[PDB]
Each structure stands twice: as C-alpha cells, then as structure tokens.
Amino acid sequence: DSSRNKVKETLRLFHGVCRKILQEDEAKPEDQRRKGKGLRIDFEASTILKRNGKFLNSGVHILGEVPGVEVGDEFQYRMELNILGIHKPSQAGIDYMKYGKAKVATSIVASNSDVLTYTGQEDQKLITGNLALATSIEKQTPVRVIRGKHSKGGNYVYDGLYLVEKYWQQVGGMNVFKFQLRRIPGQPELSWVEVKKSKSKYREGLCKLDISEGKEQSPISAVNEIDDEKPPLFTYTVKLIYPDWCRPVPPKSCCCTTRCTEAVCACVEKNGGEIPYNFDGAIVGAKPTIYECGPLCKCPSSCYLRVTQHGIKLPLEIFKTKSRGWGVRCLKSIPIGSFICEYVGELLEDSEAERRIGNDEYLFDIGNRYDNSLAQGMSELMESSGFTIDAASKGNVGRFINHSCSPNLYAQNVLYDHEDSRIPHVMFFAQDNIPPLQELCYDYNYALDQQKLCFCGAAVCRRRLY
Ligand SMILES: C[S@@+](CC[C@H](N)C(=O)[O-])C[C@H]1O[C@@H](n2cnc3c(N)ncnc32)[C@H](O)[C@@H]1O
Ligand SMILES: [Zn+2]
Ligand SMILES: [Zn+2]
Ligand SMILES: [Zn+2]
Ligand SMILES: [Zn+2]
Numbered sequence: 001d002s003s004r005n006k007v008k009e010t011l012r013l014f015h016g017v018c019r020k021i022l023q024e025d026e027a028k029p030e031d032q033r034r035k036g037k038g039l040r041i042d043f044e045a046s047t048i049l050k051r052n053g054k055f056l057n058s059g060v061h062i063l064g065e066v067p068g069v070e071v072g073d074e075f076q077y078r079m080e081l082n083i084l085g086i087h088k089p090s091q092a093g094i095d096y097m098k099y100g101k102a103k104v105a106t107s108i109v110a111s112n113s114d115v116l117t118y119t120g121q122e123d124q125k126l127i128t129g130n131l132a133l134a135t136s137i138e139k140q141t142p143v144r145v146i147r148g149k150h151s152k153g154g155n156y157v158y159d160g161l162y163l164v165e166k167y168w169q170q171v172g173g174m175n176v177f178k179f180q181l182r183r184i185p186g187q188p189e190l191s192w193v194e195v196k197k198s199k200s201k202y203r204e205g206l207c208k209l210d211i212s213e214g215k216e217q218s219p220i221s222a223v224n225e226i227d228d229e230k231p232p233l234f235t236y237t238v239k240l241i242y243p244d245w246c247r248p249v250p251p252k253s254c255c256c257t258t259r260c261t262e263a264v265c266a267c268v269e270k271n272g273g274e275i276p277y278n279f280d281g282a283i284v285g286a287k288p289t290i291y292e293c294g295p296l297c298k299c300p301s302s303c304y305l306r307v308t309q310h311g312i313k314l315p316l317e318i319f320k321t322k323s324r325g326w327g328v329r330c331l332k333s334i335p336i337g338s339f340i341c342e343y344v345g346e347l348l349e350d351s352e353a354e355r356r357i358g359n360d361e362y363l364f365d366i367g368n369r370y371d372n373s374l375a376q377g378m379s380e381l382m383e384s385s386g387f388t389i390d391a392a393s394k395g396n397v398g399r400f401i402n403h404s405c406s407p408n409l410y411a412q413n414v415l416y417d418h419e420d421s422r423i424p425h426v427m428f429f430a431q432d433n434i435p436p437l438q439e440l441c442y443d444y445n446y447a448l449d450q451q452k453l454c455f456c457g458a459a460v461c462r463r464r465l466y
Contacts (some may be wrong), residue, residue, distance in 0.1 A: 001459035003067040003068030005458075006056065010083060011432070014079075015433075016378050017044075017049065017382070024263075026278060046079045049381070054083070055082075055085070056084050057084065058085060061098075062085060064144075066084065066086055071158060072158065072191040073435065074154025074158075078091070081107075081156070086107060087106075087146055094108050094132060100139075103131070104135050104139050105129070110146065115182050116182075117180055118179045122174040124169075124174075124175055134167055137165065141163075144158070144162075145161075145162050152337075159191075160190075165181065166180050167179045195331070195437065198436075205225035205226075213236060218315060221317045222326075223317060225320070234395060236395075241394060242423075243347060248420070251294045253267075253294055253296035257298050258299065259302060260275065261275060267297065271287075271291050275304055277305065281307055286374065286412055287370065287412075289421065290308075290415070291305070292414060308342070308412075308427040309416050314330050314334060314338070317330075323455040327439045328397060330434065330437070331436060332436050333433065333435055335430070339428070340409060341398050342426060342427055345392075345399065346391075348387065349388075359392035362399050364388060364389040366389065366426065367383065368445075369443075401440055401441060402439065402441050402456070403441060403443065403465060404439075406456070408438065408441060410442055410443070411428060413425070446465060446466040449466075450466065452464065
C-alpha cells in the first residue's frame, strides 16, 4: 500500500545510489578507476542506506508475507533482499528464525510447477539452516522462495510462499541434504510460468502479429484474453511528424573520435559536465533534459551518449486490460534505467492540438514533467513548452501506455538531432526492475478539472484521471 510504495522507492533509491557511485567511477581515467580493484557499488550503496536509516524491517525476521513485497518482484543484487528484510544473509541460501523452542526457515534463495527441489547448506550436517528447513516440515510453516535466474537486470525473483514436505540425504562427491517444497495454493501465478505460456505455439488471445506491420525493426503483437475486441484503428508511425516551420536545424556536434566520457567534449558540456548514462546504457537518473550525441558527432555509434536514438530494443506487445482498454507490456524483464520507447506522433502547437477533433485521449503535453524527488533524497544520502504530440491518427506503441499513480516508467526529454528545446523527444525509461509481462505505465500528470475516474488500482491512487 503505502508499504508497496515504500518498498519500490527504497529499491529505486538504492539503485540510484549504485549508479551514481558507478557514474563517479566511470568519470575517472581508466586506471584511477576502482571497478578493477573490486569496487562493490551494491555494498557501498547498502552501507549508505543503512547509516541513513533506510532499511525496512531491520532488526527483525518475518514469517510469511512481507508487506509491500509481491510475487514476481525482481532484484538485481542479493543485498536488495537484506535491505527489504526479505532474506537477511548476504551469501547463505537459508534464512531462519526462532519458533517456539525450535527454529524454522523464513526464506531460501534457490538456483509440476508448484514443486521445487532445493539443495542444502565435507558431509553437510543437520544444523543451522538445514536443521531449520527440516523443522519447517514438522511445523508446516511458510517459506519464502527467492529464485535465482542464473550484471544489470533482475537476477532474483520472489516466487512466493512454499511448504517444506520432506527431506533426504544423498551423495553430491560428498554428502548433501535435499528438500522438497510445494507452493501454497491461491497465490498469483509464477512469472516463469506466465512467460512460458507467452512463448507457446497456441498462445491464447493473440490478435495480431505486428501492429506496426513491418515498420518497427521488431514486431509488436497484440493479445486479448478479455474480450473479442481487436486493436483500434490508427496509422503506425516510427517517425515524428514536424510542422514545416519546425523542421530540425543542424545541432552543434562534438569532435570526439572515441566514446564520450566526463565527470573537450561539447556534448558532455551540454549535459552539465557529466555523462547522464552509465557505460552499460542505463540512465543514471532523470534530469530536465538529456543531450545525446547527434548525426554529425565524430564519435562512434557505441558512444555512451547514444542510447534512445537507437530506438526500441525490448520485445513489446499491446494487450487488453479489464478496465483501461489496451495497454503495453514487455515479454521479458526490464532492467531499471532501460529505455522503453518514444512517444511518437504529430508535433503540434498546443492550440492546434486543442482545436482538432477526436484526439484528446492521445495527446502528450510536452514540458514540466521532470520529477526531482529522487535527486533530492539522494542529495540527502551523500522548463515549459507550447507544444504537444498528437498520436491519435498517427503514432507508435507509446500511444497505448496507460496512466498509473504508482508508475514503473517516467518521461524523459532528450535532444540529439536538433537543439530545439521547445520540442524535445519524449523518451520513456524504467524506474524499477520490471517483471516480465507487468503493465508499463507513467504519470499522465493531468490537472484535475482541467471527470474520469482513475482505474490504475494502486493503493495510493489519486482516484481521478482528470
Ligand atoms: C493514451 S490512451 C492509452 C491507451 C488506451 N487504454 C487504449 O485502449 O487505446 C489514454 C486513455 O486510456 C485510458 N486510461 C489510461 N490510464 C487510465 C487509468 N489509470 N484509469 C482509467 N483510464 C485510463 C483512458 O481512457 C485514457 O483516455
Ligand atoms: Zn563527444
Ligand atoms: Zn557529441
Ligand atoms: Zn559521442
Ligand atoms: Zn490511480
């Protein structure tokens, strides 16, 4: 609830600190850098959050559901599990707590879909963690299972609550304990099961293979498992449509022959003397404006300042919701800070967009969307436009992204093929590690009374869309 938002914002803060530390290391000459030394940005970020009182459920073990943590949630670092109190050991696979005179397991990190076999702990002994997991069988107390998928992206997934049914002992060439767990009925489906079904021959609800019809480099399918509706009529466009008096003037370019770096390069200077992306392509954090290198920059395509201009990289699809029409999701998980897509449509003066008929549901009002909340919290740890994008008649997949009061995306202004700040590119970025098939949403930011109810379903919902 408030708990859900607290959890998400705590993880967001953590990754913000990680990527700021990394940004500061990447700003150094490639021998003053510590990443080789075995810099540990997750460890350092964890220490910073700890000293500033940001850990949740600290000093206590929890049996069963953890408030604000949901089945399917993903984590990049094991340390995130400790920050949230999901799983306390930094390395050990089994976490446990006192229970009556005994100890029972609270959580395991694990490397017929409701059934799981888990390997324990040079013979293994029935002590500590192994003994606790064994005791879970007798008490029939719940165990949280965190599944390791195997580096940016979700590496761990919360798969929910399980019961331990039995254990046995076998040669691993020394002796090991093995445990069989079974998922408690009534929980949301495992995300790996949902993904498996989405990859099927006969996948239910498939309406259209490609709503772009060949224009996108990768097809964007449409799925409807709710009703018989097919996707709405519109002309798919991967290119912005400019008025003629707004066609791009050649921007200032940089003379760098190698990839651009900083804390010489004009484009680094545009960004305030720093690189707004990490070297792995993820955005460090939202800013009012990001300047990418342009067509005449001497730098290679691999330039750290060339990200959103390369277009969609993720496998997107549109799908039917029960109460908000069509929305957008991704067939795989999305690492925090990843570029999603642009909001593409016709660029119009606000007055022109307003005058036109039938387009009100597909307008992106440019400007005043930078949220500096995170920048502020992080500092504690250590402009307007007269233009609108009309995607009603002509637009890309961006027109289908719904609103949420607790969104997993945000809009980011980007300039690269021109310097006209009145009409920046509107680029969406992830602000969570997003589970596969989770609906993608951002804050529409409509002012109330300039009525329509908000159906985003968040616990902190502001109740009205406008
Ligand atoms: C840009 S369209 C998004 C795609 C749209 N759902 C469709 O089927 O084409 C914006 C419209 O989606 C609906 N919508 C988006 N988010 C909503 C929300 N949180 N609550 C209620 N309706 C929403 C509203 O009808 C809104 O006018
Ligand atoms: Zn440069
Ligand atoms: Zn440049
Ligand atoms: Zn460059
Ligand atoms: Zn809402």
